[PDB]
Amino acid sequence: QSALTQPASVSGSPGQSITISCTGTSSDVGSYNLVSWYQQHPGKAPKLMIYEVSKRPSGVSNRFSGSKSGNTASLTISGLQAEDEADYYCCSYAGSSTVIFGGGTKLTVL
Amino acid sequence: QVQLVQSGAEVKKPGASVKVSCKASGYTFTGYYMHWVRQAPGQGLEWMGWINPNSGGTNYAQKFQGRVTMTRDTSISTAYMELSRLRSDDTAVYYCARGGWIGLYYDSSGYPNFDYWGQGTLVTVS
Amino acid sequence: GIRPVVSTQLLLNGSLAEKEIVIRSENLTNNAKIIIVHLHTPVEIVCTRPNN
Ligand SMILES: *[C@@H]1O[C@H](CO)[C@@H](O[C@@H]2O[C@H](CO)[C@@H](O[C@@H]3O[C@H](CO[C@H]4O[C@H](CO[C@H]5O[C@H](CO)[C@@H](O)[C@H](O)[C@@H]5O)[C@@H](O)[C@H](O[C@H]5O[C@H](CO)[C@@H](O)[C@H](O)[C@@H]5O)[C@@H]4O)[C@@H](O)[C@H](O[C@H]4O[C@H](CO)[C@@H](O)[C@H](O)[C@@H]4O[C@H]4O[C@H](CO)[C@@H](O)[C@H](O)[C@@H]4O)[C@@H]3O)[C@H](O)[C@H]2NC(C)=O)[C@H](O)[C@H]1NC(C)=O
Numbered sequence A: 001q002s003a004l005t006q007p008a009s010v011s012g013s014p015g016q017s018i019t020i021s022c023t024g025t026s027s028d029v030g031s032y033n034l035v036s037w038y039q040q041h042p043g044k045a046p047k048l049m050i051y052e053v054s055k056r057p058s059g060v061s062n063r064f065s066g067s068k069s070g071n072t073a074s075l076t077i078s079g080l081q082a083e084d085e086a087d088y089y090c091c092s093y094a095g096s097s098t099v100i101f102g103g104g105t106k107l108t109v110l
Numbered sequence B: 001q002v003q004l005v006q007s008g009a010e011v012k013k014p015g016a017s018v019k020v021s022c023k024a025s026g027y028t029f030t031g032y033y034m035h036w037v038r039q040a041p042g043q044g045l046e047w048m049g050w051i052n053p054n055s056g057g058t059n060y061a062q063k064f065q066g067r068v069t070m071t072r073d074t075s076i077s078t079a080y081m082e083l084s085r086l087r088s089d090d091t092a093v094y095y096c097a098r099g100g101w102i103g104l105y106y107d108s109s110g111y112p113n114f115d116y117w118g119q120g121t122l123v124t125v126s
Numbered sequence C: 001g002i003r004p005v006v007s008t009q010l011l012l013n014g015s016l017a018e019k020e021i022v023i024r025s026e027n028l029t030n031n032a033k034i035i036i037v038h039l040h041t042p043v044e045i046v047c048t049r050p051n052n
């Protein structure tokens, strides 16, 4: 019962779409559709990015597209700028009222 | 506007206990859950159990049972977290986060929708 | 086909009526006889529970 899988780091140029995904056990992500993503700049508290697999929270523009397929939860990044240098985190329901968080991604802007 | 404030940064020694108090202001906090997360500097987040400010039910994650207690105080709108038996790798930052909505009809405890967060507190040991 | 459901009030799964709401009773003069109302259209009902 360890953390959910996540790639170590991502990189890319501004202006295009960047894909990130979490895979896990079907008892965690494959059985329940309660998966959310988090963005954390280093220095203060993170901010909520997405409620469901896809329904937008208030104060966030349509730039962050989420989806779920099988056991893969994917977030795609459209239109990168300098305000994206942060960390991206999975979290999901796991049964027995437990929440499992993801591993962590480092994003560098080229 | 609602706010979540915490205690100061704590320095400790292994084999002790630590109190962290999270205070919520600006809204009726008894209708919303309260989750706790921790993060060592350099690695990811992980999750402890929630507290329900209506009745007093409490869950916990694994490797925390018999080690951590959570307490309400509804008079001044705050939640206490006691963590005992500290060891060397517990140096981290702690955040208290608002959970779902208690609605008297569904188990909304495990809905990972943390929208408002505290500033976090830094607890270190030597 | 008869479904042997058990219900005190508010009859569950069963055969509907044909044309309209129909009243069945023994006398309709004294108040000790249970009057049965038979409906033409059904109403959905759900009943759930938390975990054990
Ligand atoms: C059997 O039937 C019963 C019938 O009752 C069913 O029970 C009902 O079940 C549904 C869902 O299954 C519940 O709905 C949920 O309600 C919550 C609460 O929302 C209310 O409060 C909002 C907050 O405002 C109050 O609180 C502040 C706090 O200070 C006060 O200051 C205010 O003055 C208020 O008192 C309020 O904004 C809400 O308004 C919404 O609804 C009205 C209805 O008429 C609309 O007009 C509004 O425009 C607005 O839409 C409401 O009054 C909702 O918040 C829940 O939605 C959340 O969860 C969804 C699922 O994830 C999610 O998709 C939503 O986006 C939403 O997300 C929320 O997530 C976090 C929760 O903390 C936060 O980030 C944030 O708050 C965000 O909003 C949900 O809709 C009913 O409450 C419940 N009935 C009762 C009586 O409790 C039962 O399910 C049936 N059983 C079956 C079918 O088995």
Ligand SMILES: *[C@@H]1O[C@H](CO)[C@@H](O[C@@H]2O[C@H](CO)[C@@H](O[C@@H]3O[C@H](CO)[C@@H](O)[C@H](O)[C@@H]3O)[C@H](O)[C@H]2NC(C)=O)[C@H](O)[C@H]1NC(C)=O
Pocket: A001, A027, A094, A095, A096, A097, C051, C052
């Ligand atoms: C309602 O209560 C039941 C009580 O059984 C919950 O079922 C239990 O859910 C947990 C979720 O973690 C299961 O644990 C998993 O077991 C598999 C078995 O191989 C393991 O591989 C996983 O790593 C994990 O430990 C547990 O087995 C399961 N109980 C049984 C008897 O199967 C259920 O989840 C509760 N409902 C909700 C919505 O949480």
Ligand SMILES: *[C@@H]1O[C@H](CO)[C@@H](O)[C@H](O)[C@H]1NC(C)=O
Pocket: C027, C029, C030
């Ligand atoms: C029951 O019905 C009969 C005839 O249908 C009638 O004579 C009798 O008075 C009724 N009972 C009462 C209590 O009125």
